[PDB]
CSV table of C-alpha atoms in Angstrom, one decimal:
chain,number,residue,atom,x,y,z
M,1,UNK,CA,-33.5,-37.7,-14.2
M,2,UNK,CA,-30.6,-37.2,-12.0
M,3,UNK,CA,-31.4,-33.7,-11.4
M,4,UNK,CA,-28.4,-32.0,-9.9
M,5,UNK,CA,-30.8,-29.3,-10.0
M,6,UNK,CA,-30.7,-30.8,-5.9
M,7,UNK,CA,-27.1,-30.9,-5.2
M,8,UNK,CA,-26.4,-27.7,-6.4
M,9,UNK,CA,-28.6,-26.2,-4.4
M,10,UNK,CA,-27.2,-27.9,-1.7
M,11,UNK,CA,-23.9,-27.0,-2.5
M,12,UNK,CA,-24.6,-23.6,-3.1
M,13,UNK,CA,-25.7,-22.7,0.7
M,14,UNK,CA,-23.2,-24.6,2.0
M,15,UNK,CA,-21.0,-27.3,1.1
M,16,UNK,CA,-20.0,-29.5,-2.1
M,17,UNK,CA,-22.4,-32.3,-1.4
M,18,UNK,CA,-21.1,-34.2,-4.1
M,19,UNK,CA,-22.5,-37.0,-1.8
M,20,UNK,CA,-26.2,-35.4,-2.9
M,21,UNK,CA,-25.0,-35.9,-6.9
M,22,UNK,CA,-24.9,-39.4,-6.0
M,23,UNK,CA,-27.4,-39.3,-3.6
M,24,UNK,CA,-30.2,-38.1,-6.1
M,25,UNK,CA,-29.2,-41.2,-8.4
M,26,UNK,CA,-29.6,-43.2,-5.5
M,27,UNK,CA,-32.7,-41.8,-4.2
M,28,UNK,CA,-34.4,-42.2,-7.6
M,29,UNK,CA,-35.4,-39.2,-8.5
M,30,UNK,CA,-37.4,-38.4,-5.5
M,31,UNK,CA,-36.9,-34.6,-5.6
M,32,UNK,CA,-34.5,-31.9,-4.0
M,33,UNK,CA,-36.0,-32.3,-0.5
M,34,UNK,CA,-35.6,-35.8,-0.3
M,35,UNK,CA,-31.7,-35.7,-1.3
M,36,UNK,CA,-31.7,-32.7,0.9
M,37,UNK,CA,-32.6,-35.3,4.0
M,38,UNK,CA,-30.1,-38.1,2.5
M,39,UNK,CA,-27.9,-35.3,3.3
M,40,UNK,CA,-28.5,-33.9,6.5
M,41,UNK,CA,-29.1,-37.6,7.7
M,42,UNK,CA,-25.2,-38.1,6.6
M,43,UNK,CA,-24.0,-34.9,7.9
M,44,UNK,CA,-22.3,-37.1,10.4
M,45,UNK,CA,-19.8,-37.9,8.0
M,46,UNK,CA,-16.5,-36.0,8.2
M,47,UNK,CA,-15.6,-36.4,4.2
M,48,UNK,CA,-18.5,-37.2,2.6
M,49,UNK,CA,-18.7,-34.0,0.9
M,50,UNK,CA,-15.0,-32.2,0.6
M,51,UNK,CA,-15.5,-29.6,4.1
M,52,UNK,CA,-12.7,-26.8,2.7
M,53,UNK,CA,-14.8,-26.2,-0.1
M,54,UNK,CA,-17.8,-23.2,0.4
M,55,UNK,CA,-19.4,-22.6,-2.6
M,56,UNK,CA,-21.6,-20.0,-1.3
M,57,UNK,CA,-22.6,-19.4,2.5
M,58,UNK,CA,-20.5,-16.5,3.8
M,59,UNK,CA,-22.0,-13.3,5.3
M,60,UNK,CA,-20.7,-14.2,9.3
M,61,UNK,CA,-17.0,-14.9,7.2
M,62,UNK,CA,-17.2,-11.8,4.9
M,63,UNK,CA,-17.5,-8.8,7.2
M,64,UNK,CA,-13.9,-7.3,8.4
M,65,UNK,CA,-11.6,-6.3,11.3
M,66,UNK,CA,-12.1,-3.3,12.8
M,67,UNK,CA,-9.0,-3.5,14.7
M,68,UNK,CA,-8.0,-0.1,13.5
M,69,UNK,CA,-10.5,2.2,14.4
M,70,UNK,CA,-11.2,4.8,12.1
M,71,UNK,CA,-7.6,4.6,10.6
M,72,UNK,CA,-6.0,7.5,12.4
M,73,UNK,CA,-8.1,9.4,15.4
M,74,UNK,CA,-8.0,12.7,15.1
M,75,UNK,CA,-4.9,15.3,14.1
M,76,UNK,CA,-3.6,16.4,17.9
M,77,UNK,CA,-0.4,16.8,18.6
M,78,UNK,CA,1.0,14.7,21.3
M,79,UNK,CA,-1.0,15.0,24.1
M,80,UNK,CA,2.0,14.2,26.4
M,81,UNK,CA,4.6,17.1,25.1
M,82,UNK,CA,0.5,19.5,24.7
M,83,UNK,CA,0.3,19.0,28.5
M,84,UNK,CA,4.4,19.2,29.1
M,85,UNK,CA,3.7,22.7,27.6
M,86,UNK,CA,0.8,24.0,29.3
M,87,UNK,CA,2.5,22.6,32.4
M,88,UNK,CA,5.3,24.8,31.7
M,89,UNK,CA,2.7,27.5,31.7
M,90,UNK,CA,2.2,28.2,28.2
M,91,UNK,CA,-1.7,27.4,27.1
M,92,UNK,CA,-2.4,23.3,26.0
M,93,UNK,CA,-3.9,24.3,22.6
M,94,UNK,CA,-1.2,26.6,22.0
M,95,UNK,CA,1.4,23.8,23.1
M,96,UNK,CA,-0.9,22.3,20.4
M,97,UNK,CA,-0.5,25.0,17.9
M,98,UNK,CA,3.0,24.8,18.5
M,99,UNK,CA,3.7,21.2,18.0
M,100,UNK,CA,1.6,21.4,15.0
M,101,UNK,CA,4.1,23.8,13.3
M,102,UNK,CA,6.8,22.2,15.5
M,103,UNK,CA,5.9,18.7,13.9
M,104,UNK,CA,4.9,17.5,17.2
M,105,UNK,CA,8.4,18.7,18.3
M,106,UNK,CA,7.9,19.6,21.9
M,107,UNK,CA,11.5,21.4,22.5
M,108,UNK,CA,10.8,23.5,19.8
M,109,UNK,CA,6.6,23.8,20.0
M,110,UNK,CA,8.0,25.9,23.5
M,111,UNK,CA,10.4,27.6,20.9
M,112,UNK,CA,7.8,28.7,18.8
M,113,UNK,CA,5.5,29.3,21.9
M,114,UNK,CA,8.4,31.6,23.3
M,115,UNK,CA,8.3,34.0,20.9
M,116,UNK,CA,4.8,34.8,21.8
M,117,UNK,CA,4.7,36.6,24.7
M,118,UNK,CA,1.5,38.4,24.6
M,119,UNK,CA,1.5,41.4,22.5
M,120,UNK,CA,5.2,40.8,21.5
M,121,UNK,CA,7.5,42.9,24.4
M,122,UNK,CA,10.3,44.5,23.9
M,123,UNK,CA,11.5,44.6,27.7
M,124,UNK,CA,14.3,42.5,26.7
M,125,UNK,CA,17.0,44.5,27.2
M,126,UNK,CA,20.3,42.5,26.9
């Protein structure tokens, strides 16, 4: 009779056309389609059917924000102090060795590269 059969279908792909509940009354049973067209027809209208209301029409809303990246790039140490260290002289992975036992610690990542000579000298001789 008043098959809201045709607003719902409205309503679910877009908005609460509670304007097509009344609408198929009004059309007289003329089928989904036709309330369909009273609709779009009166799409003009700001609050004929409650606007802040989606019932089901997302997919462009639902997605994300990949503001983040990948959550975390990559494990380096700090390329600034890695650099600092090889600048020093001392190898930029092994700055980065360093820093990673270090904790990204560049005074002491030179500490524990220090200790490294080569072959571990002992022309020390203090």
């Amino acid at each position: 009779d008043i098959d809201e059969s045709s607003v719902m279908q409205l309503a679910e792909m877009g908005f609460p056309l509670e304007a097509c509940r009344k609408a198929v009354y009004f059309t007289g049973n003329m089928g989904a389609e036709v309330a369909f067209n009273w609709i779009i027809v009166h799409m003009e209208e700001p609050d004929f059917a409650e606007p802040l209301t989606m019932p089901g029409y997302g997919g462009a809303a639902s997605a994300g924000a990949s503001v983040f990246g990948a959550s975390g790039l990559d494990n380096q140490p700090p390329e600034e102090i890695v650099a600092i260290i090889t600048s020093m002289g001392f190898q930029r992975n092994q700055a980065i060795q360093a820093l990673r036992a270090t904790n990204n610690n560049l005074e002491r990542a030179l500490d524990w590269i220090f200790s490294h000579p080569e072959f571990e000298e002992d022309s020390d001789f203090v």
